[PDB]
mmCIF file of C-alpha atoms in Angstrom:
data_model
loop_
_atom_site.group_PDB
_atom_site.id
_atom_site.type_symbol
_atom_site.label_atom_id
_atom_site.label_comp_id
_atom_site.label_asym_id
_atom_site.label_seq_id
_atom_site.Cartn_x
_atom_site.Cartn_y
_atom_site.Cartn_z
ATOM 1 C CA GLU A 1 84.736 105.768 73.012
ATOM 2 C CA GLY A 2 88.190 104.226 72.628
ATOM 3 C CA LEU A 3 88.365 102.561 76.040
ATOM 4 C CA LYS A 4 84.742 101.402 76.281
ATOM 5 C CA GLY A 5 83.694 97.790 75.789
ATOM 6 C CA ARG A 6 87.140 96.490 76.799
ATOM 7 C CA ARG A 7 87.166 93.668 79.332
ATOM 8 C CA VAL A 8 90.091 94.457 81.603
ATOM 9 C CA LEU A 9 91.423 91.670 83.829
ATOM 10 C CA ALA A 10 94.058 92.327 86.512
ATOM 11 C CA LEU A 11 96.798 89.866 87.458
ATOM 12 C CA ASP A 12 97.170 88.970 91.121
ATOM 13 C CA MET A 13 100.631 87.638 91.940
ATOM 14 C CA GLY A 14 99.403 87.418 95.523
ATOM 15 C CA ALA A 15 96.862 84.998 94.117
ATOM 16 C CA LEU A 16 99.531 83.402 91.923
ATOM 17 C CA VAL A 17 101.576 82.283 94.935
ATOM 18 C CA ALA A 18 98.670 80.020 95.920
ATOM 19 C CA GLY A 19 99.143 76.327 95.224
ATOM 20 C CA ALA A 20 102.963 76.168 95.165
ATOM 21 C CA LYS A 21 104.607 73.565 97.406
ATOM 22 C CA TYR A 22 107.402 71.774 95.524
ATOM 23 C CA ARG A 23 110.018 74.089 94.082
ATOM 24 C CA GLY A 24 108.672 75.603 90.856
ATOM 25 C CA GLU A 25 104.862 75.908 90.890
ATOM 26 C CA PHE A 26 104.499 79.709 91.086
ATOM 27 C CA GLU A 27 105.976 79.901 87.599
ATOM 28 C CA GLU A 28 103.804 76.932 86.645
ATOM 29 C CA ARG A 29 100.771 79.055 87.355
ATOM 30 C CA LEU A 30 102.478 82.171 85.980
ATOM 31 C CA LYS A 31 103.169 80.625 82.569
ATOM 32 C CA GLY A 32 99.649 79.242 82.677
ATOM 33 C CA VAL A 33 98.683 82.915 82.938
ATOM 34 C CA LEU A 34 100.830 83.315 79.825
ATOM 35 C CA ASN A 35 98.772 80.468 78.289
ATOM 36 C CA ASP A 36 95.282 81.916 78.817
ATOM 37 C CA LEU A 37 96.301 85.550 78.325
ATOM 38 C CA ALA A 38 98.087 84.240 75.228
ATOM 39 C CA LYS A 39 94.864 82.772 73.812
ATOM 40 C CA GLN A 40 92.873 85.818 74.945
ATOM 41 C CA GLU A 41 94.669 87.797 72.211
ATOM 42 C CA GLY A 42 94.143 91.475 73.027
ATOM 43 C CA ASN A 43 90.846 91.335 74.951
ATOM 44 C CA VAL A 44 92.550 91.990 78.291
ATOM 45 C CA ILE A 45 94.334 95.196 79.213
ATOM 46 C CA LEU A 46 96.680 94.402 82.086
ATOM 47 C CA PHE A 47 97.173 96.523 85.199
ATOM 48 C CA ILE A 48 100.187 95.623 87.308
ATOM 49 C CA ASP A 49 99.697 96.912 90.817
ATOM 50 C CA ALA A 50 103.280 97.841 91.671
ATOM 51 C CA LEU A 51 104.706 97.654 88.113
ATOM 52 C CA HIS A 52 108.261 97.476 89.527
ATOM 53 C CA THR A 53 107.483 93.962 90.715
ATOM 54 C CA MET A 54 107.599 92.957 87.022
ATOM 55 C CA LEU B 1 126.264 56.687 79.280
ATOM 56 C CA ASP B 2 125.908 56.295 75.521
ATOM 57 C CA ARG B 3 124.105 53.039 76.286
ATOM 58 C CA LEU B 4 120.832 54.903 76.894
ATOM 59 C CA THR B 5 118.442 56.151 74.232
ATOM 60 C CA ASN B 6 118.380 59.930 73.764
ATOM 61 C CA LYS B 7 114.957 60.117 75.409
ATOM 62 C CA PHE B 8 116.270 58.209 78.432
ATOM 63 C CA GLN B 9 119.311 60.475 78.677
ATOM 64 C CA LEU B 10 117.040 63.517 78.432
ATOM 65 C CA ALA B 11 114.942 62.271 81.370
ATOM 66 C CA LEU B 12 118.121 61.603 83.364
ATOM 67 C CA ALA B 13 119.240 65.193 82.762
ATOM 68 C CA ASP B 14 115.788 66.292 83.895
ATOM 69 C CA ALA B 15 116.052 64.015 86.953
ATOM 70 C CA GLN B 16 119.238 65.862 87.911
ATOM 71 C CA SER B 17 117.405 69.202 87.621
ATOM 72 C CA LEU B 18 114.603 67.893 89.818
ATOM 73 C CA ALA B 19 117.109 66.790 92.437
ATOM 74 C CA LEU B 20 118.881 70.139 92.284
ATOM 75 C CA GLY B 21 115.587 72.014 92.443
ATOM 76 C CA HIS B 22 114.621 70.089 95.576
ATOM 77 C CA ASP B 23 118.054 70.560 97.149
ATOM 78 C CA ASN B 24 118.455 66.787 97.322
ATOM 79 C CA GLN B 25 121.889 65.225 97.770
ATOM 80 C CA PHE B 26 121.493 62.480 95.151
ATOM 81 C CA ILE B 27 119.541 61.631 92.042
ATOM 82 C CA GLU B 28 117.349 58.727 93.183
ATOM 83 C CA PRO B 29 115.302 56.384 91.020
ATOM 84 C CA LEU B 30 112.330 58.464 92.202
ATOM 85 C CA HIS B 31 113.696 61.543 90.408
ATOM 86 C CA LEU B 32 114.117 59.565 87.211
ATOM 87 C CA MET B 33 110.618 58.033 87.362
ATOM 88 C CA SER B 34 109.176 61.517 87.897
ATOM 89 C CA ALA B 35 111.062 62.846 84.875
ATOM 90 C CA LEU B 36 110.011 59.897 82.701
ATOM 91 C CA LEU B 37 106.340 60.230 83.685
ATOM 92 C CA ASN B 38 106.671 63.959 82.950
ATOM 93 C CA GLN B 39 108.261 63.542 79.507
ATOM 94 C CA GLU B 40 106.037 64.488 76.580
ATOM 95 C CA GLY B 41 106.284 61.826 73.909
ATOM 96 C CA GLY B 42 107.686 59.433 76.491
ATOM 97 C CA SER B 43 106.669 55.776 76.566
ATOM 98 C CA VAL B 44 106.493 55.311 80.340
ATOM 99 C CA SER B 45 103.071 56.866 81.037
ATOM 100 C CA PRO B 46 101.381 55.026 78.130
ATOM 101 C CA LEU B 47 103.139 51.779 79.081
ATOM 102 C CA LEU B 48 101.683 52.081 82.581
ATOM 103 C CA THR B 49 98.269 53.101 81.262
ATOM 104 C CA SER B 50 98.212 50.069 78.947
ATOM 105 C CA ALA B 51 98.628 47.888 82.048
ATOM 106 C CA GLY B 52 95.735 49.583 83.840
ATOM 107 C CA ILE B 53 97.921 51.727 86.096
ATOM 108 C CA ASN B 54 96.759 55.306 86.736
ATOM 109 C CA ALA B 55 99.768 57.293 85.533
ATOM 110 C CA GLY B 56 98.454 60.574 86.919
ATOM 111 C CA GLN B 57 98.020 59.215 90.429
ATOM 112 C CA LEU B 58 101.452 57.645 90.111
ATOM 113 C CA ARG B 59 102.960 61.045 89.203
ATOM 114 C CA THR B 60 101.351 62.553 92.295
ATOM 115 C CA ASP B 61 102.617 59.772 94.583
ATOM 116 C CA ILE B 62 106.130 60.010 93.122
ATOM 117 C CA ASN B 63 106.228 63.769 93.624
ATOM 118 C CA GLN B 64 105.035 63.257 97.191
ATOM 119 C CA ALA B 65 107.813 60.729 97.764
ATOM 120 C CA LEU B 66 110.304 63.210 96.263
ATOM 121 C CA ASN B 67 109.076 65.907 98.650
ATOM 122 C CA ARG B 68 109.974 63.607 101.553
ATOM 123 C CA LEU B 69 113.612 63.167 100.568
ATOM 124 C CA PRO B 70 116.162 64.966 102.795
ATOM 125 C CA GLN B 71 117.184 68.461 101.722
ATOM 126 C CA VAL B 72 120.718 69.862 101.914
ATOM 127 C CA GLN B 73 125.144 62.927 91.626
ATOM 128 C CA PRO B 74 123.549 59.483 91.121
ATOM 129 C CA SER B 75 122.786 57.471 94.245
ATOM 130 C CA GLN B 76 123.936 53.851 94.323
ATOM 131 C CA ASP B 77 120.226 52.883 94.188
ATOM 132 C CA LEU B 78 120.015 54.547 90.791
ATOM 133 C CA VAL B 79 123.268 53.038 89.553
ATOM 134 C CA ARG B 80 121.915 49.634 90.608
ATOM 135 C CA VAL B 81 118.576 50.112 88.863
ATOM 136 C CA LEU B 82 120.288 51.337 85.691
ATOM 137 C CA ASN B 83 122.574 48.291 85.771
ATOM 138 C CA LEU B 84 119.449 46.119 85.695
ATOM 139 C CA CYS B 85 118.072 48.140 82.787
ATOM 140 C CA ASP B 86 121.324 47.302 80.974
ATOM 141 C CA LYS B 87 120.913 43.567 81.656
ATOM 142 C CA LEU B 88 117.229 43.615 80.640
ATOM 143 C CA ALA B 89 118.231 45.340 77.410
ATOM 144 C CA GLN B 90 120.865 42.663 76.781
ATOM 145 C CA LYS B 91 118.438 39.801 77.365
ATOM 146 C CA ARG B 92 116.004 41.387 74.912
ATOM 147 C CA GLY B 93 118.732 42.093 72.373
ATOM 148 C CA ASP B 94 118.038 45.833 72.397
ATOM 149 C CA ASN B 95 120.660 47.996 70.695
ATOM 150 C CA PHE B 96 120.224 50.739 73.325
ATOM 151 C CA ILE B 97 118.653 50.930 76.804
ATOM 152 C CA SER B 98 115.147 52.423 76.538
ATOM 153 C CA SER B 99 112.920 54.200 79.073
ATOM 154 C CA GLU B 100 110.322 51.432 79.288
ATOM 155 C CA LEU B 101 112.875 49.055 80.812
ATOM 156 C CA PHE B 102 113.360 51.362 83.802
ATOM 157 C CA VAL B 103 109.816 50.582 84.910
ATOM 158 C CA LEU B 104 110.554 46.856 85.018
ATOM 159 C CA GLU C 1 89.890 102.946 124.238
ATOM 160 C CA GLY C 2 90.476 100.688 121.251
ATOM 161 C CA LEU C 3 93.350 98.686 122.729
ATOM 162 C CA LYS C 4 91.349 96.939 125.479
ATOM 163 C CA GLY C 5 91.319 93.142 125.548
ATOM 164 C CA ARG C 6 94.459 92.686 123.463
ATOM 165 C CA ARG C 7 97.577 90.534 123.929
ATOM 166 C CA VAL C 8 101.170 91.158 122.845
ATOM 167 C CA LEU C 9 102.709 88.062 121.293
ATOM 168 C CA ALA C 10 106.350 88.741 120.469
ATOM 169 C CA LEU C 11 107.294 87.575 116.994
ATOM 170 C CA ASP C 12 110.306 85.579 118.134
ATOM 171 C CA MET C 13 113.296 84.430 116.091
ATOM 172 C CA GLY C 14 114.921 81.181 117.175
ATOM 173 C CA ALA C 15 111.662 79.473 118.134
ATOM 174 C CA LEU C 16 110.256 79.907 114.631
ATOM 175 C CA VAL C 17 113.506 78.373 113.335
ATOM 176 C CA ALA C 18 112.897 75.277 115.546
ATOM 177 C CA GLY C 19 112.386 71.617 114.522
ATOM 178 C CA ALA C 20 110.860 72.417 111.122
ATOM 179 C CA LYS C 21 113.635 71.280 108.838
ATOM 180 C CA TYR C 22 112.874 71.589 105.094
ATOM 181 C CA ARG C 23 111.204 74.355 103.101
ATOM 182 C CA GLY C 24 107.536 74.978 103.827
ATOM 183 C CA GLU C 25 107.796 73.659 107.396
ATOM 184 C CA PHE C 26 108.966 77.121 108.438
ATOM 185 C CA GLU C 27 106.050 78.325 106.314
ATOM 186 C CA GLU C 28 103.891 75.756 108.127
ATOM 187 C CA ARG C 29 104.645 77.146 111.581
ATOM 188 C CA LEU C 30 104.510 80.773 110.419
ATOM 189 C CA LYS C 31 101.393 80.059 108.349
ATOM 190 C CA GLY C 32 99.872 78.387 111.405
ATOM 191 C CA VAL C 33 100.562 81.285 113.766
ATOM 192 C CA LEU C 34 99.534 83.904 111.186
ATOM 193 C CA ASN C 35 96.293 82.140 110.328
ATOM 194 C CA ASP C 36 95.927 81.951 114.110
ATOM 195 C CA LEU C 37 96.326 85.730 114.361
ATOM 196 C CA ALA C 38 93.966 85.930 111.375
ATOM 197 C CA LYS C 39 91.339 84.002 113.348
ATOM 198 C CA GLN C 40 91.758 85.568 116.804
ATOM 199 C CA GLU C 41 89.671 88.534 115.479
ATOM 200 C CA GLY C 42 91.594 91.412 117.043
ATOM 201 C CA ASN C 43 93.395 90.152 120.157
ATOM 202 C CA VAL C 44 97.160 90.351 119.547
ATOM 203 C CA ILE C 45 99.620 93.195 119.129
ATOM 204 C CA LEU C 46 102.281 91.619 116.944
ATOM 205 C CA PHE C 47 105.711 92.616 118.257
ATOM 206 C CA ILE C 48 108.926 92.846 116.237
ATOM 207 C CA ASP C 49 111.986 93.584 118.326
ATOM 208 C CA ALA C 50 115.033 94.284 116.118
ATOM 209 C CA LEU C 51 112.857 95.154 113.113
ATOM 210 C CA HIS C 52 115.555 94.524 110.479
ATOM 211 C CA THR C 53 115.891 90.785 111.168
ATOM 212 C CA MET C 54 112.663 89.185 109.920
#
């Protein structure tokens, strides 16, 4: 009953590399992930496939 | 130089970072225009918008031009443009050299 | 059976480092040949001689 109802969204860094041409757009889209997972405010449990990437 | 407003100096420091980040040999007027158009609170984008110029499309075209520069510290082009800013400031009687003048 | 109809294109260093000067141009030629191997639909054994180099 604790972990039901939770809407769990996974980050994809392999999707986060998309759309980066000039030097510095991967971390553009990464801190945009910090923007929307900042406003999401607890709704999303994260799973990091290969944690030791982080 | 202390002749520039703080905002202008801040964009120039950013222009240097853009040049470094692109592995460019010099800081060209293009780097400075990009930094000015990218400065929050800056007067360059609104100035352009007030004249009917699409600032967003300009930003894109400037970044594209920056991406074309050779990859490998002000260029003479930039020194020259800044010298004109200085003269335009003098004609207007401006205490310091502001960002808007760089556009002209 | 299983290997019939396939090619062996050597992944070759020196020709991938050819007249593609800045950053991304190397990624343009490698992205071109790897989307090409993505669209051949099972026709090329990729070959890495000296596996530690790439």
